[PDB]
Automatic annotation (TrEMBL):
Belongs to the HAD-like hydrolase superfamily. NagD family. PANTHER family: 4-NITROPHENYLPHOSPHATASE-RELATED (PTHR19288), HALOACID DEHALOGENASE-LIKE HYDROLASE DOMAIN-CONTAINING PROTEIN 2 (PTHR19288:SF46). GO terms for cellular component: cytoplasm. Keywords: Hydrolase, Magnesium, Metal-binding. CDD domains: HAD_Pase_UmpH-like. This is Uncharacterized protein. Gene3D superfamilies: HAD superfamily/HAD-like (3.40.50.1000). Pfam families: Hydrolase_6, Hydrolase_like. The lineage of its organism: Bacteria, Bacillati, Bacillota, Bacilli, Lactobacillales. GO terms for molecular function: metal ion binding; phosphatase activity. InterPro entries: HAD-like_sf (IPR036412), HAD-SF_hydro_IIA (IPR006357), HAD-SF_hydro_IIA_hyp1 (IPR006354), HAD_sf (IPR023214). It comes from the Bacteria.
């Protein structure tokens, strides 16, 4: 069986303000059996500590801070890896912005080494202009996650991927995406998860991001029809996941 589990957060162990008890039991089962797992999210607005609290206070789950890996974390790791200058211009929220600040990157508006773009529910043309000019100057253009939409009360709204699309059109340069289903976040996840690519599994509810995160990177996949991809959609999926579940309670560890 799989020796480690990479798990999506929203839509998999909880849905919006709603709880998915089978999702709660799942990590609770992994914990009791001592099976390594990693909560992998494309979210960049929250810091892992904020996520950890949200989980414990609203969704009956208590995980160690190290069990949480976000697109923000994977992003600063990449920046550090690329080791270009220590300057940057960032569009995103407090989770992403503080993580980069904490890593020693100072805000540079003219010629930043990096131009990092995540979702900012309060973005302004001014921010886009600045980023547009900095990218053309030669800054390394990074997209935190490719997500086209953000699920909310009002409905599906512009996601980080859509903000990046605005910038790709204006600069003619495609950003290097970090988040699922792209390689960078997956490789680093494996590295932090501690187990072989060949024996890890990616568990999620979204085909385009989670399931493809596995298929594209040659990592086994498990799709739970809660959240995003609706069960009616599975029969027509271009590529069937290794496993399809209506509930995580049905997966045997």
């Amino acid at each position: 069986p799989y020796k480690g589990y990479l798990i999506d957060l929203d839509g998999t162990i909880y849905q919006g303000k709603n709880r998915i008890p089978a999702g709660e039991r799942f990590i609770k089962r992994l914990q009791e059996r001592g099976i390594p797992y990693l909560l992998v999210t494309n979210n960049t607005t929250r810091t892992p500590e904020m996520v950890q609290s949200m989980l414990a206070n609203q969704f009956h789950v208590e995980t160690s801070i190290e069990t949480i890996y976000t697109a923000t974390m994977a992003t600063v790791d990449y920046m550090n890896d690329m080791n270009r200058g220590k300057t940057a211009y960032v569009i995103g929220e407090t989770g992403l912005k503080s993580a980069i600040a904490a890593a020693g990157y100072v805000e540079e508006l003219e010629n930043p080494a990096y131009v990092v773009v995540g979702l900012d529910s309060q973005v302004t043309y001014e921010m886009l202009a600045i980023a547009t000019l900095a990218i053309q100057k030669g800054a390394l253009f990074i997209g935190t996650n490719p997500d086209l939409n953000i699920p909310t009360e009002r409905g599906l709204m512009p996601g980080a991927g859509a903000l990046n699309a605005l910038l790709e059109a204006a600069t003619r340069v495609k950003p290097v995406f970090i988040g699922k289903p792209n390689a960078i976040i997956m490789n680093k996840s494996l590295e932090v998860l501690g187990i072989q690519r060949s024996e890890a599994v990616m568990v999620g509810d979204n085909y385009l991001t989670d399931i493809m995160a596995g298929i594209q990177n040659d990592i086994a996949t498990i799709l739970v029809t809660t959240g995003f991809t609706r069960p009616e959609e599975v029969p027509t999926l271009p590529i069937q996941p290794d496993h399809v579940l209506s509930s995580l309670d049905e997966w045997r560890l």
